[PDB]
Design a binder for this molecule. Structure first.
Ligand SMILES: *[C@@](O)(c1nc2ccccc2s1)[C@H](C[C@@H]1CCCNC1=O)NC(=O)[C@@H]1Cc2ccccc2CN1C(=O)[C@@H](NC(=O)C(F)(F)F)C(C)(C)C
Ligand SMILES: *[C@@](O)(c1nc2ccccc2s1)[C@H](C[C@@H]1CCCNC1=O)NC(=O)[C@@H]1Cc2ccccc2CN1C(=O)[C@@H](NC(=O)C(F)(F)F)C(C)(C)C
Ligand code: NA
Ligand code: NA
Lengths: 306, 306
């Protein structure tokens, strides 16, 4: 029993973190085989953040201008190139701790773990969702750039996020590991703002199923609803539409609890219209939307990773 | 900016997890140097859980009756002994991944990370507090016994918890790594219940400081209070007394924000008496008490570990 915001074990990623220094800027890089990946604005200086000419800044750098340290060992840079908003620094040593890995571009609504790092050293790990507005609600300080997000499946680390920017509402923006930003954001000091966010309905339903699995059932009512009638209510409360694909993805949780998805939707409708009236669900007084159906299954069935 | 329930990087502990099988029971063990630590009820059978005679059960086991596997490699057991509620299995191979480590008995109110494991394989990591009633609000399924809790300081892993039991309210009980239970609990199938819990006041204050650091300030009022008058209110709402030691431990956060502890206490008093009136603090509609002052400092200052 119990339900926690649980992150993936971080050890496979810890062995890949390095620090990259160029001039006065230091941030984190990801060392896989003989390549270090890091945000390209490691080459920027303070006066020139409004609209950096990255190609012009980089042509004045040579391999020796990049100082890469894995723990206390310097890694010699023997080549460099820019791909979208990342630098690829080729180094003279392949990381002996390189896990089996993939680069993935995740979809809004999916979750991942973040290994927050400073000066190439891990600080902590936590779980995040890719929000519908392509931001993440992270915990990042100065120096955290280049920290990565990831999922683990069996033995394979799927890297999905590299940290670049903090936006005005205290939320965060970054790229996939090919250096393409999630969302409309850019690596310049400009006016950029998160679009209006929405609530991830399929995840709220997954979490209500987690609550039932854990014995927290007070919110189940005797009614049902159609998908269309449910979505008219979801729309009013700034929830995203629920699709038939979402209903089918919730099938395993529906089968485990014996509660049809549309019956759970009827219970969620009443929570949206009436509130919780001072009660909690899984210890929260709000509806939680950063657990996917797969997250709930993993945590309520004990999925491990080699 | 941002504030998340952040766990320690788990890699140093991952390398220590093994599975222990005795008869039909399988659980997790902790492999440090040439010793594997695990809960002693790995030697129990289903019919004999009401009141096991552990000494009598163990005298009928030999080294070969314990099957210890580190990944896919069997570790030969060459000695065994019982210490309180744990078994120490001496093995023929010292763990080459043994970190610098300590065993610590933590105090109520302090936090730690849990590496939840099944069949010796890590599943996820999350942060827990030792509750005043000596339970933890974990997320544990069948097979999780022997999973450990820990803190990391610089390079040293301080192990503080090994998982044994689930109590009726869906909360958890376990031991330090010397096998002494936290709280009055025992490893038998009996009537045991968590005592009434209380809220960890110094942690709530730490979290209110985290909120201010992050720009969430609406709850700050213009008043102050004495320590005694504050504690009369805390008592009514089932908060633990705030001590002068607690006030001093909050000193760094008070200095960083410029808000005297007793002034923050005045703001907390008003939140207890009036509620939040529909507002959130750091994204929560409840007051959070599982961040210590040190946790807040770590997360809002970027402490890393080698
Ligand atoms: C990350 O650690 C980096 N810092 C630097 C410093 C100098 C050069 C390159 C880099 S990367 C840091 C992480 C931030 C820091 C604030 C606290 N929380 C975080 O997540 N990124 C950072 O400061 C980026 C880097 C960058 C790159 C190119 C142009 C401008 C900037 C500034 N920047 C921002 O995040 C800024 N936000 C925006 O401009 C906005 F997204 F449009 F809002 C800001 C510094 C937070 C205002
Ligand atoms: C842990 O994984 C173990 N399972 C077994 C099974 C056979 C032998 C030894 C062990 S250790 C398991 C973790 C639990 C399981 C339920 C779901 N969540 C968890 O955290 N521990 C476990 O089942 C313990 C082990 C034990 C040891 C000696 C006597 C009796 C038991 C049963 N037990 C309990 O946790 C039980 N709780 C209590 O008896 C109570 F604490 F008094 F409430 C119960 C099985 C949850 C009812
Ligand atoms: Na219903
Ligand atoms: Na005040």
């Amino acid at each position: 029993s119990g339900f926690r915001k649980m992150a993936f074990p971080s050890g496979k990623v810890e062995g890949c973190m390095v620090q990259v220094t160029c001039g006065t800027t230091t941030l984190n890089g990801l060392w896989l085989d003989d390549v270090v990946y890091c945000p390209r604005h490691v080459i920027c200086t303070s006066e020139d953040m409004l609209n950096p000419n990255y190609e012009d800044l980089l042509i004045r750098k040579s391999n020796h201008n990049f100082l890469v340290q894995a723990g206390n060992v310097q890694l010699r840079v023997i080549g460099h190139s820019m791909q979208n908003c990342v630098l690829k620094l080729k180094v003279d040593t392949a990381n002996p701790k390189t896990p089996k890995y993939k680069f993935v571009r995740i979809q809004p609504g999916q979750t991942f773990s973040v290994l927050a790092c400073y000066n190439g050293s891990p600080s902590g790990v936590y779980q995040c969702a890719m929000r519908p507005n392509f931001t993440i609600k992270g915990s990042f300080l100065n120096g955290s750039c280049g920290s990565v997000g990831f999922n683990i499946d069996y033995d394979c680390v799927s890297f999905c996020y590299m940290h670049h920017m903090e936006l005005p509402t205290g939320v965060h923006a970054g790229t996939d590991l090919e250096g393409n930003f999630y969302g409309p954001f850019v690596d310049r000091q400009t006016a950029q703002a998160a679009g209006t966010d929405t609530t991830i309905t399929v995840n709220v339903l997954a979490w209500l199923y987690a609550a039932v699995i854990n014995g927290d059932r007070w919110f189940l009512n005797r009614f049902t609803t159609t998908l269309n009638d449910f979505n008219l209510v979801a729309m009013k409360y700034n929830y995203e539409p629920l699709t038939q694909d979402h209903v089918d993805i919730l099938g395993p949780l529906s089968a485990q609890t014996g509660i049809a998805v549309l019956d759970m939707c009827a219970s969620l409708k009443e929570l949206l219209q009436n509130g919780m009236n001072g009660r909690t669900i899984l210890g929260s007084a709000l509806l939680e939307d950063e657990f996917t159906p797969f997250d709930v299954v993993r945590q309520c069935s004990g999925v491990t990773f080699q």
